Amino acid sequence: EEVRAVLKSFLESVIRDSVTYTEHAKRKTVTSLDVVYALKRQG
DNA sequence: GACTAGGGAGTAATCCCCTTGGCGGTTAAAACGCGGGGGACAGCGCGTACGTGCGTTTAAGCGGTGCTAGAGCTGTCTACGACCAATTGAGCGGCCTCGGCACCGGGATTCTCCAGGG
């Protein structure tokens, strides 16, 4: 249950950043560059 | 044309305020030490909550398919942004307050310890 909580607290952000990338991409399809760009900001 | 008179600069003396070192006096913070006690931790017991073996199924990968709506590039124009300065006012550079902040006292209030009995 705890690891379920931590994944719910991690993946929602690592897909919300991709959502913002799609918003600032005029693009309905997630691509590798956009998702990796939104992802690497974690560290 | 020859020499005369006066004042700010050239030379110089006065003042004098400004600091370099060392040394002594004195308060505050840091430095050191003890009695004792509360925090750290061993020894241990256990139970119950997982560590593990095996039966019996749903499900991701498998193997393939038929396309379908969103993504990349091809012109093309045109609304707009980076190119001089006048401006003139939005705002900063320097000064002068009295007020909120600084901070401590008298007191009410509150937080804590004990040796006993209750």
- Tell me the C-alpha distance between A28 and A37, whole Å: 16
Q: Å between A38 CA and B20 C1'? A: 64
Q: For A6, which DSSP code?
A: H
Kindly state the tokens that stand for A29: 């399809």
A23: helix, coil or strand? Answer: helix
Give the nucleotide at minimum CA-to-C1' distance from A33.
B71
In chain B, which nucleotides are within 7 Å of a protein Cβ?
70-72
- Cβ–Cβ contacts within 10 Å for residue A8, how many? 9
- Maximum CA pair distance of chain A? 37
Among A34, A32, A38, A37, smallest CA distance to A12 is for A38
Question: Resolution reached, in Å?
Answer: 3.5
Cβ atoms of residues A35 and A15 within 8 Å: no
